[PDB]
Amino acid sequence: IVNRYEKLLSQRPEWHAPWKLSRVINGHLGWVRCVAIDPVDNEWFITGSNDTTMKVWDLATGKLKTTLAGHVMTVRDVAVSDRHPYLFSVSEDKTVKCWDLEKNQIIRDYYGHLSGVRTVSIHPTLDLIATAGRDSVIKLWDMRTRIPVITLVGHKGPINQVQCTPVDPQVVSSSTDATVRLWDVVAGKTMKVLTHHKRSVRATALHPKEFSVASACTDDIRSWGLAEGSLLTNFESEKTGIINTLSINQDDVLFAGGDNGVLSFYDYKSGHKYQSLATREMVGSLEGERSVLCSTFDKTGLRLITGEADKSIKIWKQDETATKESEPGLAWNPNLS
Amino acid sequence: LEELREYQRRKRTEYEGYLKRNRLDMGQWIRYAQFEIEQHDMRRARSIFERALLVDSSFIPLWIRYIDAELKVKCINHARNLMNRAISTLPRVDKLWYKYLIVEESLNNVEIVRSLYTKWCSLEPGVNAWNSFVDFEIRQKNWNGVREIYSKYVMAHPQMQTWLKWVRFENRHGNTEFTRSVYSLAIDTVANLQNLQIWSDMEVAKLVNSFAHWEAAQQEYERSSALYQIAIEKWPXXXXXXXXXXXXXXXXXXXXXXXXXXXXXXXXXXXXXXXXXXXX
């Protein structure tokens, strides 16, 4: 078996370029909880906030377009539809509100969560919504009639995150009981349970192509192949915890933001960490306020947007020089257990 | 009996009311599950523990206690079937295995633990776990078994310090050939292991000594000389090597500076003098 681990030095994974800080956008009165980008045109992005607003930022120039009020408590998660001109926002005030983009007003409230709802996922093909929160369940809403059609009972604790996939398991959910469940919605029961995490799973991201899912915990970032549900890879991590956010670029780049401010880029295929950064917090902030609460890659995949606990948005750009002049990353040491 | 009946009833109102409110706080479950035991009713108590496994199954004090109440009254195949559910739920754990192993000791059945350690080794647990399996066969014999134990055991930890316990104990068998057999295999396997593995720590001064002192027990002058040459090959009247070991160590002493290197030049030159004369 280790004869293979002798050959496991033959891969030498996939060089990638280093990431650097292009621009910093202030302008939010609270923390920036969540970020979503225009799925079609990469023209602008939306930003949840502690201060209850949402602001639409112009992506090219970083200027501000319009602000969207309408929640009385923080806005935890945000989704913008590929197929619709709709913005779905969700808050800690137990409410899930649609936003018709053409007129920029509220359209449809979705009612019937018990307590705060921290996540929204739009099903790709079905005109459904998936939301979940401290209530420990997922509700699948008919987007047109605002009916909580299907309620997926499951995790024994608050659900942190929710994803949607077109084929089987259509709903991936990750709660604080350290279980990532893969749901069968038509039968309303769990297809497969992934227990390998030690503690609460605070972030999950879907790969734009490969059809797999990444999960995160304190020290551990795993991956999982959907369908079967098998473990695929692991990601090498020294104690980086807490992992708040994962995002996957088209290029097999995997970003993991921390609560220590340390940004950690990986290589999705290998599980190698090819860089680490630390944000420079802000002028008058505290060392406690240096962290990363969200993230995304735009559709091109060359620019990363992460809102941070210092009330700032930072757009992280990939270096054009790069290659192997001096890129070389943390340089591939496969330590053993 | 009403001096009893209303006692049991009033208690079951108070305990459930609290657990009704707090699903968590296992401290109450075990207490209340203990109350129904001391009433000599196993049916209720088993329900309580089973009710309390739903709340949290990762809490081992609950798991352990619910082994006790089964063992104390000696309900065997329950505390037996339970251990099917117990260690298949939390297979990593330490305490759950040993409490299942050590309770199988007092039942005198070594066939069970033989197959227990089969799986518990198949799971590749780690140091302290394996050592209980190798040392258990010291209680038993399995001298043909124990050799195959370390067969798999250094497949789980392909590291040198575990080989040290193989070469240690395989002498204690009282067979020199079986012991020697793997040193030539330590030539073949380790070198093929280590050289093709960049780098898992294998060849250290402590491995070469394991070859060395082996031949001292068999009193071989040549088979030691093979080692030095074979080792020094792959490293990164009879007082000749006394000078060679001293002179190499003298030059081996690092010398940063001018006077430090010139001080060392006095040492190795005297060593060369007393004992490539042009290149020195």
Binding site: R4, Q11, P13, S230, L231, L232, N234, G271 | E124
Partner: peptide, 22 residues
């Protein structure tokens, strides 16, 4: 015990090869 868990389950699939096709 027996039928519930397997050694492979713990082990990841990709670690051996980085070219596996999902």
């Amino acid at each position: 015990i027996a039928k519930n868990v397997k050694l492979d389950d713990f082990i990841p699939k990709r670690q051996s090869n980085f070219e596996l096709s999902v």
